[PDB]
């Protein structure tokens, strides 16, 4: 079966989603995709489905980020007049003739009257342009272009740019830009026809990039092929990358390689359901596998955070580690379904820690962006170790964890303050005091877990003490995780609904209603703080029913104050089950499936967040979720499709059956594992990997 047919790459091409529709390989360096715009300047995302103007095609993209992006090397077919203003090469296009499938994108560009087709290898983009008009057939190569939230930034974003025509078919160059991350890239670009003339357009005073119009001698209907390979290291690295992957001009072959690569992953799960269910699921699977992105050359060389070219220990170095999001479910998903990449990811995290002094917080292009809170590379490593991954040096990995959690670092990890108080005090830490505290607690728990498993008794005791610090922020009077002053008192006034954006506030992208539940490692301890299951459940009921009338304009993703697009919320629906009311978890997961994920461009409730929203969906569809990722226990909610078969790495299969699932039959009567009654509220990683059959008998009665 061809599972790629269920991937709709336009899903999430919207303000809520921030996906890209163009061609990439799983975990690749190239995401070659259209840049679109409308009227005025859009803050974020290079493509949205409602736009009807294409600026060109860039070679690098992040999937589902809030605003960070790469968007390097804009190319655009041009016909007619060669010299124009920088913004005058754009084109309308029809939706009818735009199409995509994993590894491939095509669109008809009305203005130049050119069809564009894009495919990709791990390090190269390959384009095929058909010039219906071949009048001064040309290509714009725009090295100034990049994704910025305003136009002033756009015209100043390049710090350095050098290009060279090596011959009539080959352009090479180097760009450094600054916006979201300090990025150096090098490229080799080749055309399959000789360039007959080239022109540099005049650049703005602050523009350090270049805009090149390259021309070709062509006739109507003729094709031009362009390939471009990138490198972090140098032009020779880019050349070697190209030679390894696109040595000639085999467009159909590259497209097929990409198709087959995607199917080699997607075929690891067989979903039975409606067409829409399969489209939702396989598109999620696709989104989860776009990143982390390989950025090393084919020989393992990469440019690291010290701006030095070095060799990856494993031969491959990855970045794009959106760890605040992904530690929660995307990383667990890789441990199950993409285990052969986990050791490589851990090695990449550790190597960068050894350069910068702490694990990547939000790693991009091998650099640090410091985005969001916590240090959740710690969870990823501890989880991998707990689950039996041994393709990394555990001593080096634990040293990275220990340095991360005990040596203070930017932007938020002031451990002297933290250990003085047992929390980050709101009066001393201007923003995110509570979110940074509670999220750091999880990392200390993870550190303790790995320490215990390595027999590091003293370290385990140290980190276990820190893992209890969540208790220091729970106000029993109001029953919220509440900001706390350095003098011990609670912050007043206190509005538990007030959303924080570091406008400021003590939480991250949310409020106390969400963060009160952020104790993934010790849900029993949190229940105890509440005074038992009954008051805990009463407070959850309030979370899911509280709507605000004077604020909170877009309620996108919200069920009361539960915010499905905000990652702190992702484990919350499962807390009902963990407090002895699983039928409510079952109802709520179904509600999320009914409302928050549809197989349409505008069908997502929120940005995909580098595969985290997608991994949430895939786990929840199977009926279990990693509330506590390091534990390797998956807490039951309810399956959402009739049957899901996992093909595991050793040839075993784990089959999930939602026996009798329907619109109203959404509750679980009973669970059997390998034919025997199963009464625990979770299933272990080990039990999944053993293979077999998990049958949820579905019912109406509740
Ligand atoms: Ca989010
Ligand atoms: K923009
Ligand atoms: K860039
Ligand atoms: K279409
Ligand atoms: Na425009
Ligand atoms: Na089109
Ligand atoms: Na011509
Ligand atoms: Na950049
Ligand atoms: Na021509
Ligand atoms: Na590189
Ligand atoms: Na994790
Ligand atoms: Na989690
Ligand atoms: Na992982
Ligand atoms: Na890395
Ligand atoms: Na990184
Ligand atoms: Na992990
Ligand atoms: Na979660």
Author numbering: 30 to 86, 86A, 86B, 87 to 529, 532 to 731
Question: What do the authors say?
Answer:
Here we used a functional analysis approach, coupled to detailed biochemistry and structural biology, to reveal a pathway for the degradation of plant N-glycans encoded by the human gut microbiota. We describe the biochemical characterization of five CAZymes and two crystal structures to provide a degradation pathway for plant complex N-glycans encoded by the human gut microbiome. B035DRAFT_03340GH92 is then able to remove the α1,3-mannose, followed by B035DRAFT_00995GH3 to cleave the plant-specific β1,2-xylose, and B035DRAFT_02132GH29 to release the core α1,3-fucose, leaving a Manα1,6Manβ1,4GlcNacβ1,4GlcNac tetrasaccharide.
The GH92 consists of two domains: an N-terminal β-sandwich domain composed of 16 antiparallel β-strands domain and an (α/α)6-barrel catalytic domain. These two domains are pinned together by two α-helices, previously dubbed helix 1 and 2. The density for several metal ions was observed bound to the protein surface, which were modeled as Na from the crystallization conditions, except for a Ca near the active site, as this metal has been shown to be key for GH92 activity. The active site of B035DRAFT_03340GH92 is comprised of residues originating from both the N- and C-terminal domains, which is a common feature of the other GH92 structures. The +1 subsite interactions allows space either side of the +1 mannose for the +1″ mannose and +1′ xylose. There are clear pockets for these sugars in the B035DRAFT_03340GH92 structure.
